[PDB]
Symmetry: D3
Subunit: 329 residues, 6 copies
């Protein structure tokens, strides 16, 4: 396989604090000899694990990026035993466009793995992570949130894996994160995902869904920072005492959606995130976007639980997931 | 002045429940003989005031539209003493585009008054309301929310007016709405506004800011429905007992913004809506959108209070209002 | 009033055949020192009336432009007694974009009159015609067709005017055109129209609707050529014998539309142009564009007649005129 | 091969009338957890063939969709012996955009076969038809028309195939359709086509070209309905007597085009669809789109015949097929 | 007249060096409570004239902006006797888009005067300069270059004015600038121009054309810096000795263009900027953009001189000014 | 492999002068039966080499196209001994869009080789050149310039190749071209390039960089014409005496860039093309595009030399190559 064309502007394996870029050549109409300059910080000191920390895998998901920018700007080499490789804006082009996917190639980075060194920009990013960065990491933390179109109760997630020893390691790392909700689930759609790239190498992956709507709050930003610091202590890279608060564990959500809208319209949710519903209760109504006087279409809960995910925008489209009802363990 | 070209598909002054459209002729490349069909419901019965009820003055503001669609679809003529003229989607084209302003003319309907019958689509809407609908109304309720770029604590607002008798009437109607926050304020920018069109006629206007972010919640939707029902009881059009809960009154916010961003970047708010801050406390930080390792720009509270408004999206732009700190009476 | 900035590249009042442009200065991002070069041909010889002949008042209407390009390219000075001022592409920018309206300013040239010399490109075109060209003309012929969104039976039209002497002159010119259908109608929407600009000067105007759909046929192109040659003989500018065929006269259509769609969908017309319908007969059905199994919405004839106009495209929008039923005299 | 991700919202093999959707997951910036909901109706009763019926393979071709929506909405289970699988909008996204090709991926569905379950939306549609739906069908009817850029005399077509037994079966089905014109032709460009997908399985395919211009007429819509009903009787699925009218058979058109334009301009056709031309007769002229006085470019018939296809829009581009001359058998 | 809504973030009349913004409120879909933050620097010390210095009146013209950014960043209060008001990016939105005109309103700022406080963004900029900034200035320097579509020999220009005393003052200031070419000309198109706004107040205006093509060179940047420093010494605001080099004076160019292209194509200029041509010499040829083998269209010099302006891009459009031939005094 | 679908409208191997097109079928929404008509001229006479001559490999690079259009229009068969195959607009769609890459597929033709007959338009062009045209050529001349974003001193280039006999042949052809600068360099990025397609067949390739900025001058156009005529004499196809002027040879530039910008802003170059710099001298400064008063970012020469390449536009982006310093042999 050809070598990936990315070259860092900083060394990745030297002691100290280094701030620079992954330079990905990108020739196009408005820059014949141009590049995508992906921000990166490496902090390395003494002996320990290397953690690869990413935010904005999707460009409209902000909690991880806030936590990672602060981490990169405020952590001293002397506080670290091991290595932090910090990339707050993973699909950097998508992040710059405030979009889930890249405006260069419409690439969903989270489904681009293992990528290729001679493909689209998004594929070249994936390939560099697959073959260059991940092999130097022992563990990975990849932050997600709902994005502009979805909102979730704030959870950390661990995966059901064939390797039960790794599964337990991932579960322990997820507990350390200590988000207000905790999940362990089988990933239905594992092919091409970043999580799969990490896990199939035998490495612990920590992942989240920390809110959504294309925004973040002080509370959600604080969940990301605590969770990040906690897992970094768990991995032995940072030192100190972990913050431990109550967490609500959700029964195996099957990761699937059952309340798909069959109509475009004005979206009216009937309960808010985290709140209970009984089987048959109204979860949402879709009102006509183009006339008055018409009965709304109703979406009812198929079982009892709490609302764990919702369509975010005021307007919903045919085929959109309206809501997901989860079950507290 | 020429007559406005809008013609309703239903009568506006007949007893009963009528659902139809304001047909605004709109000739353009993709429809030579086309129209904007603005949904409208009229419900009239017995004797009483006429209320003109609008939502989606701005197209990305959803609480009012939910409350008004439900009102139009579920109210019986026999429940009404007076007249309801219900227009859930006021700048209908903006609403269809999920945008603050119309995609036809970039018109901000809320600053288009008094409009003109021979202008842009937005101006023709304004002119029809100014000269045809408002003169048949005794009172008006015009719902707002922050839109995609802003979020507010949920308030009902009444204006400081030169006519102190009307000012008191507006204040009383705002109290009846009974949102979780209550405001009375002088409008700095009154020229061209819908509120001014109503108030300068000597008529009570009820207005709100019920959340934002281009979405609504069951809680915010419920605030709109209760407030609407309450004011309609206050105006004698609907009957029943009002729902009265506690409300927090905000001292005269001067309606202005003091924490303008001077930088594009990643927006980190430090406290959430409704939460307290002391003078000099950090309210927000703007992180570099294109590198790591840089100290963030900080925005500090100029006085003590609670956060009443915030920039919503993850990314903030130079010149955006970051936040507004209000003071509890 | 300022002088219009248009300058012809040819003289407009010299004997012979001259082909050139109306140069309208147009400074913009992609040409700081640029122009719109509107094609024009002047043919002048001996003594007689001047006719001003325009096509593509709307840019997606093609019969007139075909007839006028052929006229400009094939008429000898020696065949003319008077003057032809031939502008096949009247809203030239709209014509170049294959659009009803200009892509520069969205201007509908047909409603831009009297225009202004310091306005938008479309307004400057109108102003030049209003103050420079029309005053040198005795008569005008302005070709229309339905455009991309409409189709009409092919008619020549004369207007009901306050000046009954001019009305009769216009009627006679319309009869000479001898399209397969003939109409005389009161124009409901006369303000700003080209037709009004001509007629209020006391001048004969010949106008048409010769088909539509953004295309033309050999038959429709031939209707335009015969009609043009006929009226030019009637006006004494060209010599020869007129072609006279049968014409169907339509009773005063009121120029208005009664079968507006209230739904977006798949458009199914039930009779074709020129064909009869009885009162209450189905004229069109609108099928759901996004599901199967739903009963279609039906549009029925309000009176007996023949179909004289129809919505053209497969997809119809809310507020589109579906069809117009006319009555044979 | 991976399973296709499409799941129907209805059963496809149960007796009765079922209306629903093929849910194709489609995650993108404006819907992270979204779908393309392709309308589908299944009608099954008793014993017989299964027919797979598609319209809007190309999204700007309307006759088939009208005929299929009516079929899905008006056919009773009790009228059927066999199964109808009805998909009026085959490239559903293209249909929603009124475009030949999908706005998601620019996919021409008619050249996307056999597709793949992990490709673009258009490829996933093709793959589902190739591996799931077609194998449950005995016969297929796939409607085409010219689209926005082309118009054809209305024909049903059967293909010259290597399997002469199937060729005869296809020919018989085409005769039953009984369009006003009949063709049997060798398909030059068979790779990737839907027709090839059906035929190479040993299955009868019925295909058409029923007009064009991005519109349909009552006559063309009626041709589609009769042809559909006729072939469904021929296949034994519906009962009744076929409608048989005269049909004109065209000699093997070689499916190729010889009158390509080498110029952009104003398109003037000289004869209309179905009308005769002699060898060397003028078929079309292209006039300058940007000046007057220039001789037009002429396109002449290479042999005698009738006009069977034409460029539709008023403006023609360099490299566009102007016209095709066919020969009556 | 209403007050302009712009408020500076810095004082404009205080001694010292102040860097900030003109905050122009700008509410729109992507920022409800947003602003255009126009950069501004004020440097004031001791006694003297105030100069108002602008670059990027057009956003794709770069020499002035380079010279003004350096001036604002490197000049000490102690070096100044008077006041510098420095706005390197005058049509700031156009500058941010690298466009001649604003992407907000397509406004050409140079023709927006006197503007209005309640108009478009561009008009509000003009109004603030007309009524607030210009009245506090004694002199103005407004830099231009050709932009993306034009290139000029580098000149400073002074205007022929009715006030001959001011005319002489402007001429003297232009000589001090000492560009490699010098011009004094009557402005044909004076209405709405910035230059007119300054001059009609009785104030000296210094203007330029320092190159073009949407770029600048070290030589052209150096012409701007020397010229700026020179005029600031001439006005008594900066101290030191002026740089004086040879300058070529051009005879009254009439500011008009005579070699307009009547064709789109590949543009071949035959002589370069500053080089001589004789009457009848070939100045440019336009080659067909869509075929080979065709004779090019030729543009010949109407009189002897030197090339002072040229169309820049490889592709030229109908109506573009190809070139202007000037005459050395 | 399938045959490429391109068919010439002229013979390619007949004596004489032939002007026509490569017809590449291209079906799309705005032309169902359309084509890309690539201009081509073939001139053949007597005995000799065939040269394949291309311009506008990138569509915004104009010197080659000017030289080749003139060559195709002015060369007589009788002047030729051999064959010229002249394609002035190689990526024809990119040329028509004045873009580096095709607007159809964003294809960079120069990296599309060997292409495929069933791929994108750009790939089909490449495939036709790879398998049809190149095999009939003995030599190739492929013109480049910087494009809209880059400017270069005008050089002819020859490559360092493994076949040292061919390397010497290429070097000799480059010397004959006799541009004002001469280079021989190892191509770092050879995979997929046109140059590689030619050279790996054992054939001499002549290539250039003759200026840039999306424009050309009489001087740069003249460099292209002389160089073309010279190499055609060297190859024995045209007769006459070569023009020989001084040429500056550049030491092996490594073809790489070391002064990448890490900042968006206003670009100020400090020396111009061809001018000397010493190690550590300032080559460029990037000024803030959104405020005043800030120190600029500086880019310094890493070694002594002359400026051989520069970023062209006024605005530079993060990751853009600012400049390249070369060394005179
Ligand atoms: Ca440790
Ligand atoms: Ca009452
Ligand atoms: Ca006569
Ligand atoms: Ca049967
Ligand atoms: Ca002084
Ligand atoms: Ca020879
Ligand atoms: Cl994903
Ligand atoms: Cl507002
Ligand atoms: Cl009109
Ligand atoms: Cl096809
Ligand atoms: Cl200007
Ligand atoms: Cl390249």
């Amino acid at each position: 396989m050809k070598d990936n064309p990315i070259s860092p502007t900083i060394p990745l394996d030297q002691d100290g604090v280094h701030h620079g870029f992954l330079k990905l050549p990108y020739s196009r109409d408005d820059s014949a000899w141009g590049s995508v300059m992906i921000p990166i910080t490496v902090i390395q000191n003494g002996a320990g694990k290397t953690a690869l920390l990413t935010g904005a895998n999707h460009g409209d998901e902000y909690e991880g990026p806030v936590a990672l920018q602060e981490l990169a700007a405020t952590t001293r080499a002397e506080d670290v035993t091991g290595r932090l490789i910090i990339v707050p804006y993973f699909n950097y082009p998508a992040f710059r466009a405030s979009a889930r996917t890249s405006p260069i190639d419409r690439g969903n980075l989270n489904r681009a793995f293992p990528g290729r060194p001679d493909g689209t920009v998004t594929q070249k990013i994936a390939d560099y992570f697959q073959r260059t960065l991940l092999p130097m990491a022992d563990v990975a933390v990849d932050f997600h949130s709902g994005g502009k179109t979805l909102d979730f109760v704030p959870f950390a997630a661990a995966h059901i894996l064939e390797d039960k020893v790794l599964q337990d390691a991932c579960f322990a790392a997820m507990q350390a994160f200590n988000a207000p909700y905790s999940v362990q689930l089988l990933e239905i759609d594992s092919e091409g995902m970043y999580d799969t790239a990490v896990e199939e190498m035998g490495k612990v992956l920590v992942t989240t869904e920390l809110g959504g709507g294309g925004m973040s709050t002080a509370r959600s930003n604080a969940i990301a920072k605590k969770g990040l610091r906690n897992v970094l202590i768990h991995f032995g890279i940072l030192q100190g005492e972990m913050q431990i608060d109550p967490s609500v564990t959700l029964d195996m959500p099957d990761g699937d959606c059952y309340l798909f809208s069959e109509h475009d319209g004005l979206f009216e949710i009937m309960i808010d995130l985290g709140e209970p519903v009984q089987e048959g209760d109204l979860v949402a109504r879709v009102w006509s976007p183009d006339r008055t006087g018409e009965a709304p279409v109703e979406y009812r809960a198929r079982r009892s639980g709490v609302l764990i995910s919702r369509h975010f925008p005021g307007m919903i489209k045919s085929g959109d997931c309206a809501a997901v009802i989860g079950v507290v363990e």
